[PDB]
């Protein structure tokens, strides 16, 4: 992938671990400087704040909506359901807002599929989402100064929220 892919993989992993911990155990089954590990946690914290202040993508509210709609997810189609949400979310392009919204979705979706009794469901959702960051969004992330840049972006949002 792009420049510094190896470090970004590890940092994307840390951001996801921190993000899912802060918002949701069931979704699971080094090489970083203490700097990069700290920037990952800070980014997951700001993003959690942005999500909570954005009712359209709030984690709990979306799990409630997925259940009310009877979203037909099974062990057989759950990846293709996830991939369709991914395709539509970024079909117009990629920016930090759609990244935040997609990651919020991925936590709501992981909780939802785990509530549907899909064994390994949330773990698979976590791993798919981590690899969207690694493989499809990496060029955007690095272009916008990585997770350090996200914190600058998110602070600006929270000032405005």
């Amino acid at each position: 992938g792009p420049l510094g892919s190896s470090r970004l993989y590890l940092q994307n992993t840390a951001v996801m671990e921190e993000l899912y911990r802060r918002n949701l155990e069931y979704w699971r089954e080094d090489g970083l400087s203490e700097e990069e590990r700290r920037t990952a946690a800070d980014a997951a914290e700001r993003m959690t704040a942005v999500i909570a202040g954005t009712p359209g993508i709030a984690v709990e509210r979306n799990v409630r909506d997925f259940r009310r709609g009877g979203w037909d997810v099974t062990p057989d189609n759950v990846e293709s359901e996830f991939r369709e949400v991914e395709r539509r979310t970024f079909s117009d392009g990629v920016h930090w807002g759609r990244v935040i919204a997609f990651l919020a979705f991925s936590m709501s979706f992981a909780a939802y599929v785990n509530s549907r009794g899909i064994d390994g469901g949330a773990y698979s959702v976590f791993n798919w989402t981590l690899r969207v960051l690694n493989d499809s969004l990496a060029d955007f992330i690095q272009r916008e100064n990585g997770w350090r840049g996200f914190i600058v972006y998110a602070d600006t949002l929270l000032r405005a929220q």
């Binding site: 997925f66 359901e81 949400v85 991914e86 539509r88 807002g97």
Partner: peptide
């Protein structure tokens, strides 16, 4: 895929746009 998946993705695109608009004031 389900209608729900396409509609969820579409709404994530739009809410993401609203989130990003706040960066530019």
């Amino acid at each position: 895929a389900s209608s729900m998946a396409s509609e969820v993705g579409r709404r994530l695109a739009e809410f993401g746009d609203q989130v990003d608009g706040q960066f530019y004031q």
